[PDB]
Amino acid sequence: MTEYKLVVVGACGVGKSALTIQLIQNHFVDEYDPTIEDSYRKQVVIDGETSLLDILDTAGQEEYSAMRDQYMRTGEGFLLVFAINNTKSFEDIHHYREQIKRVKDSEDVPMVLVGNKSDLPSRTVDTKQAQDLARSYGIPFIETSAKTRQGVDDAFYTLVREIRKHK
Ligand SMILES: Nc1nc2c(ncn2[C@@H]2O[C@H](COP(=O)(O)OP(=O)(O)O)[C@@H](O)[C@H]2O)c(=O)[nH]1
Numbered sequence: 418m419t420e421y422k423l424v425v426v427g428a429c430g431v432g433k434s435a436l437t438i439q440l441i442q443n444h445f446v447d448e449y450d451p452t453i454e455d456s457y458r459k460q461v462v463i464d465g466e467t468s469l470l471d472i473l474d475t476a477g478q479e480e481y482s483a484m485r486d487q488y489m490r491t492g493e494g495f496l497l498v499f500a501i502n503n504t505k506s507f508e509d510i511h512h513y514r515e516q517i518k519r520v521k522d523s524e525d526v527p528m529v530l531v532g533n534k535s536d537l538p539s540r541t542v543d544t545k546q547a548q549d550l551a552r553s554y555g556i557p558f559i560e561t562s563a564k565t566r567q568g569v570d571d572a573f574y575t576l577v578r579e580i581r582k583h584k
């Protein structure tokens with residue numbers, strides 16, 4: 418059985434932990450300590466083939482050590498998560514993608530752009546802007562709500578399809 422390392426990145430407060438914990442444990446967390454970085458292991462059937470997902474929900478400071486880079490370089494695919502009511506988190510997507518390109522030494526790294534908090538009515542990032550950014554990067558785009566579970570499975574499944582295509 419194939420195994421994949423998936424990494425969830427994006428600014429503080431976008432919903433990285435809530436997304437991950439909905440996927441793994443099927444409940445919505447309101448307050449999860451932002452320093453906790455943990456990994457979860459979940460067997461999933463995607464397009465009729467089972468894979469073991471090893472999912473890292475990131476934490477940390479804005480700093481870049483050799484050993485941190487070497488750990489992040491183990492990820493096989495990355496979720497680039499922003500929140501649809503947080504423009505700064507959308508602008509930050511570029512930075513996260515560039516770090517991952519830098520550590521992976523590659524521009525073709527499996528990635529999915531995720532626009533979270535889709536339940537909220539006060540959107541500041543237009544859907545078209547996000548679709549246009551994902552088009553430019555050559556990656557899929559998925560809107561999610563960790564609150565309602567809308568799109569959660571599909572975001573991680575879509576990332577596994579992208580790793581499968583790349584391998
Ligand atoms: N309304 C709404 N709030 C969310 C959603 N996802 C996360 N949140 C909330 O946003 C805050 C930050 O979420 P968290 O998962 O801790 O974000 P992280 O800092 O990216 O790990 C928490 O209060 C969450 O309950 C979502 O889809 N909708």
Ligand SMILES: *CCC(=O)N1CC(N2CCN(C(=O)CNc3cc(Cl)c(Cl)cc3O)CC2)C1
Nearest residue numbers: 427429451475476477481485486489516517520
């Ligand atoms: C509010 C806390 C939170 O949710 N986060 C801070 C923000 N991240 C955490 C992970 N980060 C690092 O570990 C920085 N180092 C790093 C990142 C990346 Cl993407 C790569 Cl490819 C290499 C290295 O060394 C960044 C900020 C999320």
Ligand SMILES: [Ca+2]
Nearest residue numbers: 433434450451
């Ligand atoms: Ca978190």
Ligand SMILES: [Ca+2]
Nearest residue numbers: 525554555556
């Ligand atoms: Ca591509």
